[PDB]
Design a protein around this nucleic acid. Structure first.
Ligand code: K
Ligand code: K
Ligand code: K
Ligand code: K
Ligand code: K
Ligand code: K
Ligand code: K
Ligand code: K
Ligand code: K
Ligand code: K
Ligand code: K
Ligand code: K
Ligand code: K
Ligand code: K
Ligand code: K
Ligand code: K
Ligand code: K
Ligand code: K
Ligand code: K
Ligand code: K
Ligand code: K
Ligand code: K
Ligand code: MG
Ligand code: MG
Ligand code: MG
Ligand code: MG
Ligand code: MG
Ligand code: MG
Ligand code: MG
Ligand code: MG
Ligand code: MG
Ligand code: MG
Ligand code: MG
Ligand code: MG
Ligand code: MG
Ligand code: MG
Ligand code: MG
Ligand code: MG
Ligand code: MG
Ligand code: MG
Ligand code: MG
Ligand code: MG
Ligand code: MG
Ligand code: MG
Ligand code: MG
Ligand code: MG
Ligand code: MG
Ligand code: MG
Ligand code: MG
Ligand code: MG
Ligand code: MG
Ligand code: MG
Ligand code: MG
Ligand code: MG
Ligand code: MG
Ligand code: MG
Ligand code: MG
Ligand code: MG
Ligand code: MG
Ligand code: MG
Ligand code: MG
Ligand code: MG
Ligand code: MG
Ligand code: MG
Ligand code: MG
Ligand code: MG
Ligand code: MG
Ligand code: MG
Ligand code: MG
Ligand code: MG
Ligand code: MG
Ligand code: MG
Ligand code: MG
Ligand code: MG
Ligand code: MG
Ligand code: MG
Ligand code: MG
Ligand code: MG
Ligand code: MG
Ligand code: MG
Ligand code: MG
Ligand code: MG
Ligand code: MG
Ligand code: MG
Ligand code: MG
Ligand code: MG
Ligand code: MG
Ligand code: MG
Ligand code: MG
Ligand code: MG
Ligand code: MG
Ligand code: MG
Ligand code: MG
Ligand code: MG
Ligand code: MG
Ligand code: MG
Ligand code: MG
Ligand code: ZN
Lengths: 207, 114, 118, 123, 198
RNA sequence: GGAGGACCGAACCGACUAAUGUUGAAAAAUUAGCGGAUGACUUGUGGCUGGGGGUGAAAGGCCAAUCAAACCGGGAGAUAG
RNA sequence: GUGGUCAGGUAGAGAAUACCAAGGCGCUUGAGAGAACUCGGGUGAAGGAACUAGGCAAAAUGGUGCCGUAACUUCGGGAGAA
RNA sequence: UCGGGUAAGUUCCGACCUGCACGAAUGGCGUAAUGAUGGCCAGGCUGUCUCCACCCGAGACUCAGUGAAAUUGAACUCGCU
RNA sequence: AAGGUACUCCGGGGAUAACAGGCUGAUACCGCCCAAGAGUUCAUAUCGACGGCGGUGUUUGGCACCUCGAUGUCGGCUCAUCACAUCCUGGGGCUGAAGUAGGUCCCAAGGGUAUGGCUGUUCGCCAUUUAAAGUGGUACGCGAGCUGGGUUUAGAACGUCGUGAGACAGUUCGGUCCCUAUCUGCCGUGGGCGCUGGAGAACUGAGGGGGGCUGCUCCUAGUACGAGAGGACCGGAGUGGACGCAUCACUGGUGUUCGGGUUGUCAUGCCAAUGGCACUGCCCGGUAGCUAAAUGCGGAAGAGAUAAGUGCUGAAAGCAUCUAAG
RNA sequence: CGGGUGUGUAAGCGCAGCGAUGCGUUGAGCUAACCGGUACUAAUGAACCGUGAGGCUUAACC
């Protein structure tokens, strides 16, 4: 299974050999199991977990009842992780960063930074047309978007300008530089999706 | 912030000497050839200093074998064994990029006497 | 994108913006309350309040810094002689903005901005 | 960061003074050559009675670059000019008998071990 | 660099040397042939590159192999200069009387080994031969070629081959396949003499 | 001493390039550059030349946003396989 | 687009240009926002015409004094050569 | 075609003469100077380009006021074969 | 009773040409049949005379069916998408396959598949790369996306033809590329209603999309193979090119909102100190953010069912036979 | 408010010099979008929308 964490930011770790490792600091506070899904009731085996804290006024009555049944305190959100056949958890159990103590590589999922509406040059690495040499008002424009009477349309999935970022992204096979249970910190090599303070789902690498 | 600051502070060197732009400094750097590890010295004017905690860096410019060489060092990196200010220089600017276009008598820096 | 950026362009160049706020800051010091567009009032706080903070300590250098920012000796005098002493105890929040409907000519959102003591 | 059309100084005594990169070898659409990268060059300028002559097409290894090289700690070493050592096309061994100016540790390989030995300073 | 006919000569001598190795039972005779063959190749190239020398060394080895021969032939082939096919408009200038004349596409190797280019219309039973003269001006001849095919000594190559009578009324039998003919031809002069004979 | 279809360069007179503009700010311009700038120079006012006619350092150019034959009215409801 | 007249100060060769005087104006829709893209600009690592039909456009050069300045020439020039 | 220039030159320059179809006032061949003239090369210079990035402004976008146009048989106006 | 018109004009025609489409397929291109021969020998490793039979729509054409009350035409740029007759990478049979490296045929469309010099070029040649630099269709894809060098107005000239006006499937220099998107389509992003009491969350996964490239080095091993020369299969490891995603710790760029230097001028009474204006006046540095040239990560392994192909057992058909049952 | 970062030793005053200027006070002054804090200012008591136990048939169970 995996844990939910927050992106504290980025830094470096200097090795004695003198290699500097780019690391992303992920704060993995204890994740409290709010619900356990089973094949009999839900048709799939999974655990729902919460992390962090939520303002009591901000928590709604329907949300509060779900937390109350678990016996856990309200967390900022609810996330599910699918269970392997061997794995077994109980409602109210807390899972810490020590889970990843023996995990060499992890996959980190987060919402990418939102770029808003983006042109084809930025979004799809389209080439710009000539800056000079007579180009009329068509420096960063997409160019042709189709053929002619055949097929007489634009095909679906045509790369065009539109929203860029603010989407779920996974970076796979990131090395685990350090696991710190005392500080509730997971240090992973390299950049991970999202801005500082964003929610990060960390799992053991599938590959 | 505070979390990263704690992590950054734990790795930071406490022996880093005071140096300013325009100072002539010698940086001893660890160099490994095969099994053997030795200290190589790089001596030149400090032309730029970036103050950024653990991410602090400084740039040293020398003329070596008739070729101008600039080396950006990570201050708190273990590779840098030691830093020593050979001479203190009197300049008015933080960054000495103008020294890149100057050679010989033009590139001379006055000593700061205090 | 404008991630983590501060300040409003207000459909002007930088020189016009600076000049307008220098005039508007003077107006607020002189009258202690002025009617302006809501976005401009929010920007004016970031210019006027530091001037009052500067006025708290009276020195030739501070007065000259205030003169550089305001370019009005009357405003500088009132700041150091009156506003500085008046707001000495208060830490920030030297002004308040009150929304006051829409302008007839252009339907612009309008607000009053005043010194809190007034 | 050397590309086709880039002019390089010569860091050896082959007799070439100025050379131009005509190809970055080693890949399809490979844009750039850094220190330690072999390039195809034409001799734009040469000394009289040199080993090499103007208009000759041969290989070279980049030894110094303005862009510089990055070390594992994150340190950077940059040079004031881009320089190369002329190599025989087939042998890919230095034509010159001497190396002038400092060279990087990136050239510390069996292929370019001769250059390191000849070089005055290795940084 | 060598002419196609020159390459063909080299090819022939190499084949002879291989045949000699197989057939000749006397070492001394073989030595003479080895020298003869070596000299001939040395005659072909005023200056021999190390690759040629290496090839010669392989040739010198008594235990020559057909694969080795082929490789050696390939190395020698590189030196050969290909025959240049004329431009469509040039060709038309060569054969003004002929209308809408066309040349079938020739393999680059074929061009390399071809002293002259000859193609048959077949429909009109016409063979067109184009060759650059000593002045290096292209020269074209077109003549009737017999549909019937018989084995006989071909005038162009002076070798027994499948030949069809050619009339540009004395006639000279020539190889039906010009490409085969070109391979057989080892001397440009022989072809020139054939043209003179016409 | 002070020549020049002399030189550099504003006004002034042009109009080589590019961009913009093309239901324009504009039925030919704007912006950045560009050429001439005491001369076969440029400009005000008034005048003269009239349509197979004028005028043209000549492009069929120009002759009131019109030109291998102006515009207006008439023959005239030309004629139109 | 439209002929004539008047011509302050500092700097400047100047009626260029910059900032100002007298004098006159802010150009008869505004207010926000701070996407793509278009227009008009600023800056740019390393490379430097590889762009392109073409260095188109851009960048660059730019003053005064002095030194110095080629082929060629109709003896003037070329020449502000460089 | 040969030579020069380039790593590579259908352009360029110098030759050759095989002038499809030069040639002597509808001038021949030269020619200093001059040219917003055609071609070619070099140094400098650069976002022209490798390959785009960021930034400042004017639009675009949203709100209030005013308020066009070309076009239009009628429309309940999808893909594929 | 002869000509010119590119200085041109009007009425008409898709009744009739040039472009593209269509029909056709001579031609073209691709494949097959026979096998004279070549191949030392030996038709069929490879190749294939004389002849024969197809396929494609793919060149040059034929026709004149659509369009002449307008369907913009070469090349480039930008952006593509499909086919497979496959250029590379994958699998396999035969070989005149010792190895290495090839030839040829079969299967295979997942991904990938140069930059320059010259020329308007497409192309081609050349230089230097690459695993390779595929061939075609898409109005010879793509001008309501760009370009305008080619080409086909008006100016001018040369050669040439003409008495001449003029003209050239000759050349030369110059020479206006419009459109604010209604609909379909496409990329994004909302509103409505529904889903049967209302509401807040977490999901399942029908279905859809993305991605899928590859070099070199080392080890196995100078091992198998070979007279040597040379030199593997299989398997494993490392490090790259190109491409993609994310990010800003580092290295940098930018940073007219930060600090400083500095020219001219004007003002703040003046001095001193400041401010305005001159591209941010000109510059030098530079925070955050954004960002690439910066630095992390990815393509997979594995599984299932198969292609060509290889078999096991096995009759029909006492043998043989991978197939008919299995 | 504190810090950090950047720029690079403010102004004023004193001293030295004929003066331009230097030096001391002084790594000074100033410092955007950063970091850690802090209710000083502004996020209002309300109001509004959305209801009042959720069809029929059949089967099973209680
Ligand atoms: K008339
Ligand atoms: K005459
Ligand atoms: K004459
Ligand atoms: K000229
Ligand atoms: K006529
Ligand atoms: K077939
Ligand atoms: K056989
Ligand atoms: K038509
Ligand atoms: K094979
Ligand atoms: K494929
Ligand atoms: K295609
Ligand atoms: K078409
Ligand atoms: K086109
Ligand atoms: K269209
Ligand atoms: K357009
Ligand atoms: K429609
Ligand atoms: K960064
Ligand atoms: K930055
Ligand atoms: K000033
Ligand atoms: K001081
Ligand atoms: K001071
Ligand atoms: K400081
Ligand atoms: Mg965003
Ligand atoms: Mg481009
Ligand atoms: Mg235009
Ligand atoms: Mg543009
Ligand atoms: Mg903010
Ligand atoms: Mg506005
Ligand atoms: Mg300004
Ligand atoms: Mg004059
Ligand atoms: Mg005129
Ligand atoms: Mg102008
Ligand atoms: Mg002149
Ligand atoms: Mg002049
Ligand atoms: Mg007119
Ligand atoms: Mg008439
Ligand atoms: Mg009548
Ligand atoms: Mg009538
Ligand atoms: Mg006038
Ligand atoms: Mg004046
Ligand atoms: Mg003026
Ligand atoms: Mg903008
Ligand atoms: Mg722009
Ligand atoms: Mg610039
Ligand atoms: Mg640059
Ligand atoms: Mg640079
Ligand atoms: Mg340069
Ligand atoms: Mg080019
Ligand atoms: Mg090109
Ligand atoms: Mg230009
Ligand atoms: Mg410029
Ligand atoms: Mg060139
Ligand atoms: Mg030549
Ligand atoms: Mg050229
Ligand atoms: Mg010539
Ligand atoms: Mg005459
Ligand atoms: Mg004449
Ligand atoms: Mg002449
Ligand atoms: Mg409106
Ligand atoms: Mg359709
Ligand atoms: Mg004409
Ligand atoms: Mg005419
Ligand atoms: Mg007509
Ligand atoms: Mg018809
Ligand atoms: Mg047709
Ligand atoms: Mg049609
Ligand atoms: Mg046949
Ligand atoms: Mg057809
Ligand atoms: Mg008919
Ligand atoms: Mg129509
Ligand atoms: Mg196939
Ligand atoms: Mg595909
Ligand atoms: Mg698959
Ligand atoms: Mg090419
Ligand atoms: Mg087309
Ligand atoms: Mg195509
Ligand atoms: Mg257009
Ligand atoms: Mg179109
Ligand atoms: Mg054209
Ligand atoms: Mg003549
Ligand atoms: Mg799928
Ligand atoms: Mg797929
Ligand atoms: Mg990359
Ligand atoms: Mg940062
Ligand atoms: Mg920087
Ligand atoms: Mg800057
Ligand atoms: Mg005054
Ligand atoms: Mg003063
Ligand atoms: Mg003023
Ligand atoms: Mg002014
Ligand atoms: Mg698999
Ligand atoms: Mg059996
Ligand atoms: Mg502070
Ligand atoms: Mg500091
Ligand atoms: Mg100051
Ligand atoms: Mg001090
Ligand atoms: Mg904070
Ligand atoms: Zn023959």
């Amino acid at each position: 299974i995996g844990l939910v964490g927050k992106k504290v930011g980025m830094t470096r770790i200097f090795t004695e050999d003198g290699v500097s490792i780019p690391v992303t600091v992920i704060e993995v506070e204890a994740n409290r199991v709010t619900q356990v899904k089973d094949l009999a009731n839900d048709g799939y085996r999974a655990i729902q977990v919460t992390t962090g804290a939520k303002k009591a006024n901000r928590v709604t009555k329907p949300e509060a009842g779900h937390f109350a049944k678990a016996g856990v305190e309200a967390g900022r959100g609810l996330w599910e992780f699918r269970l392997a056949e061997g794995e077994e958890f109980t409602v109210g159990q807390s899972i810490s960063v020590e889970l990843f103590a023996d995990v060499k590589k992890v996959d980190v999922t987060g919402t990418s930074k939102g770029k808003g509406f983006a042109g084809t040059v930025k979004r799809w690495n389209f080439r710009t047309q000539d800056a000079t040499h007579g180009n009329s008002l068509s420096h960063r424009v997409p160019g042709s978007i189709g053929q002619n009477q055949t097929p007489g349309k634009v095909f679906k999935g045509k790369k065009m300008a539109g929203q860029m970022g603010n989407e779920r992204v996974t970076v796979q096979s990131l090395d685990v530089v350090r696991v710190d249970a005392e500080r509730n910190l997971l240090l992973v090599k390299g950049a991970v999706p999202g801005a500082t303070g964003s929610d990060l789902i960390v799992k053991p690498a599938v590959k | 912030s505070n979390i990263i600051k704690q992590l950054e502070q734990e790795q930071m060197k406490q022996d880093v000497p005071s140096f300013r732009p325009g100072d002539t400094v010698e940086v001893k750097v660890w160099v490994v050839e095969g099994s053997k590890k030795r200290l190589q010295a790089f001596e030149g004017v400090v032309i730029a200093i970036r103050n950024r905690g653990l991410h602090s860096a400084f740039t040293v410019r020398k003329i070596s074998n008739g070729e101008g060489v600039e080396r950006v060092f990570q201050t708190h990196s273990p590779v840098v064994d030691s830093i020593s200010v050979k001479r203190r220089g009197a300049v008015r600017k933080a960054k000495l990029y103008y020294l890149r276009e100057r050679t010989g008598k033009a590139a001379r820096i006055k000593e700061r006497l205090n | 994108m404008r991630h983590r950026k501060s300040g409003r362009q207000l459909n002007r160049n930088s020189s016009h913006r600076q000049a307008m706020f220098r005039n508007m800051a003077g107006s607020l010091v002189r009258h202690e309350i002025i009617k302006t567009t809501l976005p401009k009032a929010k920007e004016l706080r970031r210019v006027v309040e530091p001037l009052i903070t500067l006025a708290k300590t009276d020195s030739v250098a501070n007065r000259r810094l205030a003169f550089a920012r305001t370019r009005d000796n009357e405003i500088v005098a009132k700041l150091f002689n009156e506003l500085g002493p008046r707001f000495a105890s208060r830490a920030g929040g030297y002004t308040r903005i009150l929304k006051c409907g829409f302008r007839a000519g252009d339907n612009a959102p309008m607000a009053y901005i005043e010194l809190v003591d007034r | 960061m050397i590309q086709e059309q880039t002019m390089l100084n010569v860091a050896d005594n082959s007799g070439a003074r100025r050379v131009m990169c005509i190809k970055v070898l080693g890949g399809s659409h490979r844009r750039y050559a850094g220190v330690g990268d072999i390039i195809k060059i034409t001799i734009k300028e040469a000394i009289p009675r040199g080993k090499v002559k103007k208009g000759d097409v041969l290989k070279a290894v980049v030894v110094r670059t303005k862009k510089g090289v990055r070390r594992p700690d994150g340190s950077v070493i940059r040079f004031d000019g881009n320089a190369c050592v002329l190599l025989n096309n087939n042998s890919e061994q230095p034509i010159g008998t001497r190396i002038f100016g400092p060279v990087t540790r990136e050239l510390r390989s069996e292929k370019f071990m001769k250059i390191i030995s000849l070089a005055p300073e290795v940084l | 660099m060598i002419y196609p006919h020159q390459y063909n000569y080299i090819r022939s001598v190499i084949l002879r040397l291989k045949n000699v190795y197989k057939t000749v039972n006397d070492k001394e005779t073989v030595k003479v042939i080895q020298s003869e063959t070596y000299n001939d190749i040395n005659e072909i190239f005023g200056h021999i590159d190390d690759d040629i020398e290496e090839s010669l060394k392989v040739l010198m080895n008594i235990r020559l192999s057909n694969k080795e021969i082929e490789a050696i032939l390939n190395k020698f082939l590189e030196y050969v200069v290909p025959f240049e096919l004329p431009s469509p408009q040039k060709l038309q200038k060569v054969f003004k009387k002929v209308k809408k004349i066309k040349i079938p596409q020739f393999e680059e190797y074929d061009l390399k080994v071809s002293s002259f280019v000859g193609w048959n219309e077949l429909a009109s039973n016409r063979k067109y031969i184009i060759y650059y003269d000593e002045k290096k001006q292209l020269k074209g001849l077109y003549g009737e070629i017999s549909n019937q095919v018989v084995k006989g000594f071909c005038t162009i190559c002076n070798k027994e081959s499948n030949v069809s009578l050619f009339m540009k009324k004395k006639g000279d039998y020539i190889c039906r396949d010009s490409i085969h003919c070109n391979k057989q031809l080892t001397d440009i002069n022989q072809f020139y003499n054939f043209i003179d004979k016409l």
